[PDB]
Design a binder for these strands. Structure first.
Lengths: 98, 79, 109, 95, 99, 83, 106, 92
DNA sequence: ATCAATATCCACCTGCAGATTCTACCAAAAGTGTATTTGGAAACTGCTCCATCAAAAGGCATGTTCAGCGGAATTCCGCTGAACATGCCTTTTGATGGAGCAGTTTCCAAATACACTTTTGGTAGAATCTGCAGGTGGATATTGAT
DNA sequence: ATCAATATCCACCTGCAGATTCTACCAAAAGTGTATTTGGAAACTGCTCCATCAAAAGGCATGTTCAGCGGAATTCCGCTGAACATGCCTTTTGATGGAGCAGTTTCCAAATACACTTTTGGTAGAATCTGCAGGTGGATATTGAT
C-alpha cells in the first residue's frame, strides 16, 4: 500500500537524466521523422548514419536547452508546471519568434 | 502520423534533463511542433549542401555545415 | 643531427606550424601570410588545447577514470566561465548537461 | 583512398605533457579536433577582416594577436597572447 | 470642479507618441560624456569622430528599446503591467546575455 | 576635467521614453538603476571592441567605422552612419 | 558595351566582379558569378525600394527617409527575417501595443 | 570612395518615378547592398572550400542565395540571377 | 518516533568493444636554397574635422504632493497531471546485396596574366531648385466628472 | 448620457536646409584582344557502407486513483505617476587652434616563385592489450505510512 508522492519521482528523474549523456528519443522513430521531412525537399535521399546521429544530437541538445528556458518562464510566473505559453515566450525572446 | 513517433515518455525525458519538474498535458504536441520546425530549417540547409555537391546521400558534414550557419555549431562529427 | 629542424621545434611547439601556414594560405584569408602568423596561431591553438585537456583530465580523475570522454570535456567547459563563454554557442556531442535543479523546485523540507 | 588530415596526434602529444597517465576516447578526440578547427577558423576569419579593414594584403602575427584579443574572454586572451608572443620570439631568436 | 487623467491613459498616449517618432530619446551631451568616460577607462587619450558617438547612441537606444519589448513580454507573462528588474533579468538570461 | 558618474546622465525620464518606444505601460521604481547597469555593460563591450580596432590601426581617433565593425562583431549590425 | 548592358542590368557587373576578386573569396571567380550576384543585389534593392516608396506615399511624403525603409522592412515577413539582426538608424519601431495593456473591456 | 548610390537611384526611378531619397536613407541602402554582397559572397566562399573548389561560379552564388534568403525572395532572386546569366551568355 | 518498501551506494568482478603497439608502403608535405618581386613602413605634410571656449534661452529634468489602483498575500477547491502495475507492439540487433561515394584519367571550355584603348563614376565647387519642418488655427475626437 | 476639458488629427503656408543639377578634370576603371595555363565536368570503376529483412529484446500505451497545483475572489497597503512649480544645463549658432588622419613618394625587409631533397603523418592488415560498463551482493539512506 505504498505510493511515491508526485515530485519525488520527478526529482529523482531529473537527477538521473542530468547524470547521463545517452540519447533520449528512440533512434528508429527519429530516423523516420528525419527522412519524412527531407523527402519534402528532395526525393530518394540516403543518409549516412553519422548524419542522422549529428541531427539527433543537435535536436536533443536544442530541446533540452529550450526546456531550461521554458522552466525559467514557468517559475517567473510562480508555477512549477511548464506550459505551452512558457515555450512560446522563450522562443519569442530567443528570436526564433520576436 | 510519424511525428507521434517522438513519444510523451521521450519528450518527458528531455524535459527532465532540462531540469523540468512538472509538465502540462499540452506540452507534448507543442514540443513536437518545435522539433519539426527545428529539423525543417536544418535539414533544408543540409539538403541544399547535398544537392550542391551533386550527391544523393546526406553527409554528416552537410548537417554539420548546416548547424553551423544556423548558429548551432556541433562538435564531434567534425566542428 | 639531421639538419632540418621543423618550424614547430624552432618555435618550441607540439602543434604543426607548417600545417597551420599551409592552412592559412589555402583558406583565402588574405593575399599574403607573414612568417610569424602561423607560429603565433599554432601557439594559441596549442595553449587552448592544453587548457581544455588540463580541465577535462581533472574532470576524469574526479570520476575515477583514466580516459577522457565527451562527458569530461563538457563538464570542464561548462564549469569554467571563460571556456564556457568561448564555446557558448557550441554543442559537444554526448556531453550531457551540468547537474542543476532550480532551488524553488527542491522538496519543501 | 585520399588523406584525411586531423589534429589528433598533436592533441595527444599535448595531452601527455598535461596529464601523462590519462587517455582519451575516440569520440573525445573527434570533439577536440572540431574544437581546434573551430578556433582556427574563428581566429583566421577575424584576422582576415582586420587586414581587409585596414586595406592590407598580409595577415601577420599582429593580426593574429588582435584577432585573439577580440575573440577570447579576458584571462584566456591574456595567456594566449603571451603564449603566441613567446613562440614567435623563440622562433625569430634562432637559426 | 477639477480634472485629472487616470494612470494609464497618459502611458498609452506616450507609447503611441514615441512609437510614432524616430528621434533619439537620450540627451546628446550626457550620452557623449558617458561614452567618453567608459572609453577613457579602457584607453586614455582617445578622440572620437562625432559620427562614432552618434553610431553608439543609435545602437544603444535600439538595443534598449528591443530589450524593453522583451521585458514587457516577461512582465505580462507573470500577469503584471509593471515591468520589474526581474523581467529585464529573465529576458537577458533567455537571450543568452548570461544564461 | 575628470569624468565621473556620467551614467546618471541617463535620466529617469529618458529611460521612461525608451520604455514607451518599447511599448511599456507601467514602470517599477527599481527599473532605472537596473537599466543604467545594462546600458553600461552594453557600452563596455562595444567600445572595448571599437577601441581594439582603433589601436590595431594605430589611430588615436575612434571612427564610426570602428564602432560599426565592433557592432557587427557582436551580431548587432548597424546601417548608415558608419553606424 | 558594358557587361551590365549585356546582362540587361542596372547594377555594375564590372564593379561586383572586381569586389569579388579583392575580397579574397576564392582563388578564381567565374564570369557568371558577378552577373548573377549583381542581378540578385538589384532585385533586393528593387524590392525594398518598392516597399519603402509605398510607405513614403502612405505618409504623404515624396522623399524616402530611414523611417520608410524601416516600416517597409518590419512590415514584410521575409525582409524582416533577412534583416532580423540589423538596425536601421533613425528607423524607430512599428506601432504596437500589447492587447492586455489597452483600457476598458469587451 | 565608391558607393552603390547612382545605381540605387536608377532602380528607385524604375519602381517609383516620382519619389526621391534622403542622403541618410541612401546611406542605409548602401549599407544594405554591401551587407548582402558580403553575406552572399561569404556563403559562396565556404561552399567552394567545402567542395574543394578554387572557383566561385554562378552555381555557388545560386546555392549561397538559396541558403541565405527566405523562401519567396530566394525564388525570385534566383530567377533574376539565372535570367541575367542566360542573357549575358548569349551576348557575344 | 516506529517500521516497511525502496532507492541509492559501494566494493568487487571480468568480458570485450574500443584503444594501444609494431611493421611496411608512399603521396603529400615540409624543409631548403636561389632569384625576383613588392607590400607597406618611414619621412614629409596637406588639410579635415575634433576639442574647446563663448554666450543666450527655453526645452526638459527635478522635486513635491497626493490619490488611483496594481499586485502580493490569503483562503478555497475544481480537476488535471502523475504514480503505478499489465500486456505486447515497436525498436534494437546483427547478417547481406548493391547503390553510390570516391579515386583516377582525360582534355577542353574557361579563367589567368599582359598590353592598350576608352568610358565613367567621383568630386570639386557653383547654383538653383524644392520637399517639408514647424508655427498656426480650428474641426474632431477621446476622456473624465457626474 | 449630456458636459467640459484636452489631446489629436489635419489641411494650409513659407522660410530654408538639404537636395538633384551642372560645367570640367580624370585617375581608375572597365572593356577589347591575343597568348598561356588549368580547374573540374565527364566517363569508368572498386570498395564502402547504406537500405532492407528477420529474429531477439525491452520500453511504451493504457486506465484507475487522488495529491496538490494554481486560478478565482477578496482585501488593503504602499508605490507609481499625474499635475505643477522652478530653474538648470542641454542645445545651438559660431569661431579657432592645431591634433592627427590621410595623400605621396622612397626603398628594403620580407613574401612569393619555382626547383630539388628529405621526413612524415595517414592508411591498411595483424596481433595484443585494457579501462570500465554492466552485473551481484550487502549495507544503509530516503521516503511514506502511522
Amino acid at each position: 500500500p505504498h505510493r511515491y508522492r508526485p515530485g519525488t519521482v520527478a526529482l529523482r528523474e531529473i537527477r538521473r537524466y542530468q547524470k547521463s549523456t545517452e540519447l533520449l528519443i528512440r533512434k528508429l522513430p527519429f530516423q523516420r521523422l528525419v527522412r519524412e521531412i527531407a523527402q519534402d525537399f528532395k526525393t530518394d535521399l540516403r543518409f549516412q548514419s553519422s548524419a542522422v546521429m549529428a541531427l539527433q544530437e543537435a535536436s536533443e541538445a536544442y530541446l533540452v536547452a529550450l526546456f531550461e528556458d521554458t522552466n525559467l518562464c514557468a517559475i517567473h510566473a510562480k508555477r512549477v508546471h511548464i506550459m505551452p505559453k512558457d515555450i512560446q515566450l522563450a522562443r519569442r525572446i530567443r528570436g526564433e519568434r520576436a | 502520423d510519424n511525428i507521434q513517433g517522438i513519444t510523451k515518455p521521450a519528450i518527458r525525458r528531455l524535459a527532465r534533463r532540462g531540469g523540468v519538474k512538472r509538465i502540462s498535458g499540452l506540452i507534448y504536441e507543442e514540443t513536437r511542433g518545435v522539433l519539426k520546425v527545428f529539423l525543417e530549417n536544418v535539414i533544408r540547409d543540409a539538403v541544399t549542401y547535398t544537392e550542391h555537391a551533386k550527391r544523393k546521400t546526406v553527409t554528416a558534414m552537410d548537417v554539420v555545415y548546416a548547424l553551423k550557419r544556423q548558429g548551432r555549431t556541433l562538435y564531434g562529427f567534425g566542428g | 643531427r639531421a639538419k632540418a629542424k621543423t618550424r614547430s621545434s624552432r618555435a618550441g611547439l607540439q602543434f604543426p606550424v607548417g600545417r597551420v601556414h599551409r592552412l592559412l594560405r589555402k583558406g583565402n584569408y588574405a593575399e599574403r601570410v607573414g612568417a610569424g602568423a602561423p607560429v603565433y596561431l599554432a601557439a594559441v591553438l596549442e595553449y587552448l588545447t592544453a587548457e581544455i585537456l588540463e580541465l577535462a583530465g581533472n574532470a576524469a580523475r574526479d570520476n575515477k577514470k583514466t580516459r577522457i570522454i565527451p562527458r569530461h570535456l563538457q563538464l570542464a567547459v561548462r564549469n569554467d566561465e571563460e571556456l564556457n563563454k568561448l564555446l557558448g554557442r557550441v554543442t559537444i556531442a554526448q556531453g550531457g548537461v551540468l547537474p542543476n535543479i532550480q532551488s524553488v523546485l527542491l522538496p519543501k523540507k | 583512398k585520399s588523406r584525411k588530415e586531423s589534429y589528433a596526434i598533436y592533441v595527444y602529444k599535448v595531452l601527455k605533457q598535461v596529464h601523462p597517465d590519462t587517455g582519451i576516447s575516440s569520440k573525445a578526440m573527434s570533439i577536440m579536433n572540431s574544437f581546434v578547427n573551430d578556433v582556427f577558423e574563428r581566429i583566421a576569419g577575424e584576422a582576415s577582416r582586420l587586414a581587409h579593414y585596414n586595406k592590407r594584403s598580409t595577415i601577420t602575427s599582429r593580426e593574429i594577436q588582435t584577432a585573439v584579443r577580440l575573440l577570447l574572454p579576458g584571462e584566456l586572451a591574456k595567456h594566449a597572447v603571451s603564449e603566441g608572443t613567446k613562440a614567435v620570439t623563440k622562433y625569430t631568436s634562432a637559426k
